[PDB]
Amino acid sequence: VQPNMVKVLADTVVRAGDLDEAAAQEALKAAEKALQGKGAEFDYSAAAARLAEAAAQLR
Amino acid sequence: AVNAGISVSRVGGAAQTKIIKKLSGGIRTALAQYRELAAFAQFASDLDEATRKQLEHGQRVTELMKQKQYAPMSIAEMSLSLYAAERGFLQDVEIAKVGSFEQALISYFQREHAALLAKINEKGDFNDEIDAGIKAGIEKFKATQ
Amino acid sequence: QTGYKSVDAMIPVGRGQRELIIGDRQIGKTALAVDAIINQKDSGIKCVYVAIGQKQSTIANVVRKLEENGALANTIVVAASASESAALQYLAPYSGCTMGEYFRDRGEDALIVYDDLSKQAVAYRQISLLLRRPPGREAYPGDVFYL
Amino acid sequence: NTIVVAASASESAALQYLAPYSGCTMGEYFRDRGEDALIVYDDLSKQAVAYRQISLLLRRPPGREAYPGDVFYLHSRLLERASRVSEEYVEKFTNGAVTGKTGSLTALPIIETQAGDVSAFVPTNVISITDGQIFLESAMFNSGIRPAVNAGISVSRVGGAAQTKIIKKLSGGIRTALAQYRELAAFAQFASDLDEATRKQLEHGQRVTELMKQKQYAPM
Amino acid sequence: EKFRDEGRDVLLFIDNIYRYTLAGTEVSALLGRMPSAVGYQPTLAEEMGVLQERITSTKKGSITSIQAVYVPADDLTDPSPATTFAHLDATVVLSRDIASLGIYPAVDPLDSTSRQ
Amino acid sequence: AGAKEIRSKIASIKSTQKITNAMEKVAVSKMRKAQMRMAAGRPYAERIRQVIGHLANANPEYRHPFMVEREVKRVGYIVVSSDRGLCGGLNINLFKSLVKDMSGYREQGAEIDLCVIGSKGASFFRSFGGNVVAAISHLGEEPSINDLIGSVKVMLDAYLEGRIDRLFVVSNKFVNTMTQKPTVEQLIPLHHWDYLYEPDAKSLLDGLLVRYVESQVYQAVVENNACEQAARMIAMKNATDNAGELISDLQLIYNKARQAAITQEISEIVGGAAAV
Amino acid sequence: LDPLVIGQDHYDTARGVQYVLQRYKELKDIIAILGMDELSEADKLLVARARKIQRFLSQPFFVAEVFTGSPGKYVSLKDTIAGFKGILNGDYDHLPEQAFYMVGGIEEAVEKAKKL
Amino acid sequence: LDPLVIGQDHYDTARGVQYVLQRYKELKDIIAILGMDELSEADKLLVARARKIQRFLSQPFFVAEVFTGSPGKYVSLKDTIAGFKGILNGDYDHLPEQAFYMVGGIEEAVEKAKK
């Protein structure tokens, strides 16, 4: 409340812990982990530079 | 309108003069790097440095090979234009002012270094004296004109 | 030397070489060959220009452009236009070639343009089909490579 | 009201070659006396086949698809007889017995093509001779549009001069709606995402295209 | 040519040049000549050149020709338009979309070409 | 070889070309729909940010852990990606800027942790082996903010226990209908009168910062959806043009085969007629 | 194939089968390039009903039992009209497309669907 | 090209090279229309190995020294079998494809990749 302006900032859903913690648990459970990689691989750029050069042959 | 991808001469540089054979080794590769990259100029601000500089050299060599009808050039004038393309004196010059640059350079060498052009127009010789005189004339053109 | 930067830098032509000029219509084939003729006016190489199947006004414009650039006195022009007999259109390249071979056989250097060999093959196809010779690919005679 | 002229498939090729000229002479009887006639040639293609058989058996020199050099003259001699003649020609022919009337013979030749190839020799000749063409397509015939008229490529050179006032007044918006449906026909399965005016033009084009269907043997 | 030889500049209109070519095909088929590629007469370029080389500018006057061209099977590399386009100096292309806008004459400014 | 199979390939590439021309217009309509969903979420977030920047200056007696910074070697990333194909370099340039920002922390010895939105980024770290702490896919053409609550809370709870020290979001911003710019943007380190506070204002700050992080992640997801539809528009226009190029090449091959067939049939007729 | 010869019902069943197959003939290369998911819902239902129409057109023969290994079937006209009307009306939208291949009557397609 | 003449190893390398180039030839229209990005992952890997095979099949010649200025190469049969086997097995998936162009051995592609 401002003396010339009223601002209600609402909610799409009821914010309580029994609804929000279950969404946090479903977000933790749905993380698909197929191989336990170290994260320091080079193969990202070796696919990405080839796929970046392949996209300009189309346009 | 010469398609440099598929035009070829079987005799090649056995027929050519020495200065023309020495200075045209980098023309075909600059036109080759331009073939596919000529469609990339609509997004070329978000590219790496070597691809951007290869495409800039490709646009400069492509703008150098345009030529009017009924205007022949001698051995010395094509050697001046090929040395201006090959040795990196087109690098700070924009595309729409390439060929006007070429014409002004030819006129400057006709009024300052006419004995050098008469030396080149004998049998197309190349040595270190001609190399140094051309590079000193092009640096004085790029500094004072 | 043709005087063009792209031709003399990339695809160089020597004395005695055969170098084809090939492409679609109206994109500058006569222009490159005529400017290669005009660049021989101070080089010692004499010139022959053979027009096969062209229009007469095109031939007269070519000879006026040869006189306006100072190279007509170095050049023989042989003309067999589009409303001549097909025999003369077939035989004009060999006649101009004999005219260049005069300077070849005496230790001098010449340069010849055949500004359409494709119209000479059409005229030889006309002569061979009127003799009822059996044709092959694209109704051309079997000896057309030999032509 | 109809004279039927028949030259069947087991008869001589000379009779199949002469049948359209004989039927044209019977139709011209009505044109020369200030009356109006309409003639259908149900296969001019088979007449060209019979004339090709006659010309090859007489050892006349062949050309494209082994047709002789006068097959264009064969169809042009026949199709130029279909005409509208002036009142002066009719008064000259009948020696003043019929006065103040024009006469006419209208032709509807029929050409069978092979898999939509209209650039074969005999269809190119009859397309070049005539005043207009009605193209029928097999794909529109299989899609339920039982008069299979492709309105995009069919054409009449006479046009709105050959129409009454009410038909010429109403037909132009139907032509505009069919051309808009031919431009917008790919968008019909994705019409829920379109703009409102584009959807309105698409629905009007679908309604006009559904109105162009008509049963056989019910002329309006 | 008589109108050109009175010292004038003459227009000559040819309604279709392809029907001139096809009449040459039919006349060559009636005389029993051996046909050339895609069915045409073996004197195709010569019979085109006898007609087109008489349409010129001379020292007395000129004849300028306007000839409408049909293209067979929408093929520009067919021998009849390939022989005809070797003689043409300009093309004028008429368009339906310019005429539907009410603009007359309906010449396409992008599709019409000229050697001049 | 023969003209029939060339004619059937021309009909096949024409039937592909019509519907790629249609789905370009479908991508235009879904881009405009995602633009009106982009325009509606902004006056929540500017009022929340103005209230936060008033309350952080009016009350210096409490600092939330989001508002201050810690220099410990671990960072977190929230990657926003699509689930379908036919996007010309949206995901690929986004992934390129992602490995570009990740390599400055990977060479330092710092640990990284990833939250993934979309199926293509899940395929990316499933193929190459990224360590994912929270994942979500199958959000449609209108995403809702109640789907994002869990993955954002896993990201914030990993900040609140001291595991994450800095959070970023990697998503594409709508510059214009022709330009999609892959950025990395920081989230967690963000008139002389005073608001009355009906609860404690500390718990008000504890709520409003969490709602601001949720609104920023939701605006990034909806703007990435609009960038996906613009890239789909550019890709279907390119597919229509390359289809027309292949149609023109096959039409030249068909006209060559038609002329050769007429010449061969006439040579057979003339050679048969000369022998009789 | 006239409504005054075979009746109205036979004619609408045959033209409905031909309309659905002519539509699927235009959708085949589109599914061959982009896939099944990129169409609308009525296209997906029509492509599934059309593949079932193309498998149900097949029949084992008594003279071809040396080639198939399976016995031959005789199917009446009314069984054919009722089966193709039942596929066209969506009364078998739940069965897989392999159930309609080499069966005979529509009841045999239902018996084969329980064995896949 | 028969296993009782040249051995099983050389024949298997040649059949694997021809398999990879045939499956690359079958994807030309779909790569021309939609691009490489909508292939599957094994298809993308096979297109990458196919372009490296196509670049490694070229060779500078001794009689073509006038055309280019690059020196000619003689490659033995053992180095050809070992190099194409190393491309087909995945030993040079980290190399760029333009390092496989106009070299003699696979070791010259290894030195050309570091430039």
Ligand SMILES: Nc1ncnc2c1ncn2[C@@H]1O[C@H](COP(=O)(O)OP(=O)(O)OP(=O)(O)O)[C@@H](O)[C@H]1O
């Ligand atoms: N270097 C050039 N710069 C500008 N215009 C040029 C150049 N070369 C040729 N042209 C123009 O291109 C046009 C076509 O050239 P030209 O007549 O030589 O072509 P062509 O292929 O020989 O044609 P034709 O079919 O008549 O033999 C001419 O109008 C000419 O002026």
